Design a protein around this nucleic acid. Structure first.
Length: 764
RNA sequence: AAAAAAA
């Protein structure tokens, strides 16, 4: 039900001086007064209600407000510094040239409760109020997008920033970060049509780009569909002065009431609202809407000291300590970043294979395959290469050499490719793949892999994967034609990493000598993530080794945009059933890693998902009562950590080193959480993964779980690196994403995977 | 779809 109290802060790893974009807030101890605001009509969006309050605050200065300046939620909440005569109800107010406004007093918001909640005794309404104060004035000036703000200097990038009030130990802080987002450019639709008579293929793409967007007339209409018929032919039921309803072409209607004759009658019409039709000549896309979905990569990113400068530049630009509404309440936001002292954990040694074994020691989150080979190499006796690019643009000599080098490296990689390709084909057409794909497994018993080669963007990868893992059960490895003409000793080396484990092999295992005490008993590791598009796809992956290296995946479909997992009881049980079949043991502890859950869903996710993970254990045996560790991981937060000393920055990114852990200062005051940069930053500013532990029966310490989380990120089997999140939560992302390429019993039947592929990691 | 990182 409720999260556990933080056990400790731990003492592991070397200390490092850092900075965070958390800015301390000097909060007064006065009370805040909340007022509900019911305005008619209630249909108006966020921005208009803020203008209504903005107009009535000046209008009724003598009547009700006076010296005070009120902050506005944007909907139905209004906080003030000191009380108003409005208290006890009631005032009904008009806004002149139509809105009737009602200001009703609610309750007093005591700020000391926060000053007390950070030192014993977490009132959401108080933190809800402090954000409204800081959010209010930037909402006036800039265009708000969720929590972030943006301004205006066929997509277009708008540079803005993010703002949020977050609680921390002993005090309150303000989180600010530079943010950029793609926005649909304020274009006339005719140029929006131009930038993306129309053919059915020419037309159907435009409908995908503009559906659900808002346009104006040369009113506010949200587009629903793009007509098949042009303006000169599309009709609508027009009534006449007589009363009878004749059919009228949309081109001729503008020719009568609006005196406008269309220049582009051959183009279709934007359907707005039903029964309304608008041609493309008179429509401009509404400015200020976030885009739903190379040049965008150059504007984004920058060194970590570069981003650290922009946040401080922006902190100078806003100057929150001189914000008239922040002045009214007395809040003071420090102009300096918060100094935090993190800890860099030791990376676990990694045992490789072959008779020469070896011990890879990761430095800056990287090691190499050099003078090493696989812990459990899989010698491939036979396989079938199937290139899908023509010998007009490819040649046997490529594949004669591509396999020549590939065989040479797998010889060094520990999975010796001793056989030779049973056949080597050229085949084109996504449809003819399946008939060929059927004929290859029958010709060769003990067959393993099929190296299909795919040139550029193509939906054949969807069918090669759909027919590959769900039906017949053969292994499948894809590679672009761009990588068969050019073979560097690493492009092929990362391939042998994926292929070996996809054939049941073990590329590497953590040093068992140096391992936390949670491995003294049998323990299973789970990862879950939901990817939304109609149906949301949920995947749950479970540990199968005690190393732990090999995993197994279960993926289901569920309600559109649903973040909870109802089939968690079914999937965890099925996952944990496969654990006994492979390990011969029952896992004493379940370590659940959950991804994609915001704190607004913590009480909703933990309640159901922990009960489902307990329903899974109880269906096995009446007394199978292991310990559940519920860990929500977060990568889409906004916390940033920068190095105080230039002698600790790593690479051109200037980012923090791998294994940087933070328990103090900027974490949740009472509960148990921490930020952990398991990886090293190659590009831009690193975003350290945050782990909030909602349930823990296993009685973990802060150290042991932080080291366990760090060690699991090394166990990724697709690169010689540490990664963003632990491998279970990472593998869950692949599986739910792999099910997307599998295109209502048939959907679950399409997402269901074959038995022989379910044996190991088809997804890696 | 060699891979990680970056929105």
């Amino acid at each position: 039900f409720k999260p556990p109290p933080r056990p400790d802060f731990g003492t592991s790893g070397r200390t490092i001086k850092l900075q965070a974009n958390f800015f301390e807030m000097d909060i007064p101890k006065i009370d805040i007064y909340h007022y509900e605001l019911d305005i008619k009509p209630e249909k108006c969006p966020r921005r208009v209600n803020r203008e209504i309050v903005e107009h009535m605050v000046q209008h009724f200065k003598t009547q009700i407000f006076g010296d005070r300046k009120p902050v506005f939620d944007g909907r139905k909440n209004l906080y003030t510094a000191m009380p108003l005569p409005i208290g006890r109800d009631k005032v009904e107010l008009e806004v002149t040239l139509i809105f009737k406004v009602s200001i009703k007093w609610v309750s007093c918001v005591s700020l000391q409760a926060l000053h007390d909640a950070l030192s014993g005794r977490v009132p959401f309404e108080t933190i809800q109020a402090l954000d409204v104060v800081m959010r209010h004035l930037p909402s006036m000036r800039y265009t708000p997008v969720g929590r972030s703000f943006f301004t205006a200097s066929g997509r277009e990038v708008w540079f803005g920033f993010h703002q949020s009030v977050r609680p921390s130990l002993w005090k309150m802080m303000l989180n600010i970060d530079v943010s950029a987002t793609a926005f649909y450019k304020a274009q006339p639709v005719i140029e929006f049509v131009c930038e993306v008579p129309l053919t059915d293929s020419q037309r159907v793409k435009f409908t995908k780009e503009i559906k659900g967007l808002k346009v104006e007339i040369t009113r506010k209409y949200r587009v629903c569909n793009v007509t098949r018929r042009p303006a000169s032919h599309q009709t609508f039921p027009l009534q006449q002065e007589s009363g009878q309803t004749v059919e009228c072409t949309v081109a001729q209607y503008f020719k009568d009431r609006h005196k406008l004759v269309l220049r582009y009658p051959h183009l279709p019409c934007l359907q707005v609202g039903k029964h309304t039709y608008l041609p493309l000549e008179v429509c401009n896309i509404v400015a200020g809407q976030r885009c739903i979905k190379s040049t965008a990569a150059r504007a984004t990113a920058r060194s970590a000291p570069d981003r650290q400068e922009e946040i401080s530049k922006l902190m100078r630009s806003a100057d929150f300590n001189t914000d008239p509404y922040v002045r009214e309440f007395g809040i003071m936001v420090k102009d300096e970043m918060t100094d935090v002292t993190g800890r860099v954990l030791q990376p676990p040694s990694i045992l490789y294979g072959g008779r020469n074994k070896a011990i890879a020691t990761p430095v800056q989150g990287v090691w190499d395959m050099r003078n090493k080979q696989f812990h459990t190499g899989i010698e491939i006796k036979v396989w079938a290469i199937a290139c899908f690019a023509p010998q007009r643009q490819c040649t046997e000599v490529h594949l004669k050499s591509f396999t020549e080098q590939l065989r040479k490296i797998s010889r060094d990689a520990g999975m010796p490719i001793q056989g030779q390709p049973c056949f080597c084909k050229y085949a084109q057409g996504a449809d003819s793949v399946e008939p060929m794909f059927r004929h290859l497994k029958n010709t060769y018993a003990g067959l393993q892999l099929v190296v299909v080669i795919l040139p550029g963007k193509t939906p054949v990868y969807a069918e090669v994967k759909r027919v590959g893992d769900t039906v017949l059960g053969m292994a499948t490895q894809c590679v672009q034609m761009k990588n068969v003409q050019r073979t560097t000793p690493q492009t092929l080396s990362n391939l042998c990493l994926k292929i070996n484990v996809k054939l049941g092999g073990v590329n590497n295992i953590l040093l068992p000598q140096g391992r936390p005490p949670v491995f003294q008993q049998p323990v299973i590791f789970l990862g879950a993530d939901v990817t939304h598009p109609k149906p949301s796809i949920a995947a749950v992956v479970g540990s199968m080794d005690a190393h732990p290296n090999r995993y197994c995946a279960t993926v289901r479909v569920q309600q559109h945009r649903q973040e909870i997992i109802q089939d968690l009881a079914a999937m965890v049980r099925e996952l944990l059933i496969q654990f006994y079949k492979s390990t011969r043991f029952k896992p004493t502890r379940i370590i659940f890693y959950r991804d994609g859950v915001s704190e607004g869903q913590f009480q909703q996710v933990l309640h159901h998902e922990l009960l489902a993970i307990r329903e899974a254990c109880i269906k096995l045996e009446k007394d199978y009562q292991p310990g559940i560790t519920f860990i929500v991981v977060q990568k889409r937060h906004h916390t940033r950590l920068f190095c105080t000393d230039k002698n600790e920055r790593v690479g051109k990114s200037g980012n923090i080193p791998a294994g940087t852990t933070v328990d103090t200062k900027i974490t949740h005051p009472t509960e148990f959480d921490f930020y952990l940069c398991s990886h090293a930053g190659i590009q831009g500013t690193s975003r350290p993964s945050h782990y909030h532990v909602l349930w823990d029966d296993n009685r973990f310490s802060s150290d042991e779980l932080q080291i366990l989380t760090y060690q699991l990120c090394h166990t990724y089997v697709r690169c010689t690196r540490s990664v963003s999140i632990p491998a279970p939560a990472y593998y869950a992302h692949l599986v739910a994403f792999r099910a997307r390429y599998h295109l209502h019993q048939a959907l679950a039947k399409a997402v269901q995977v074959h038995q022989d592929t379910l044996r190991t990691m088809y997804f890696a």
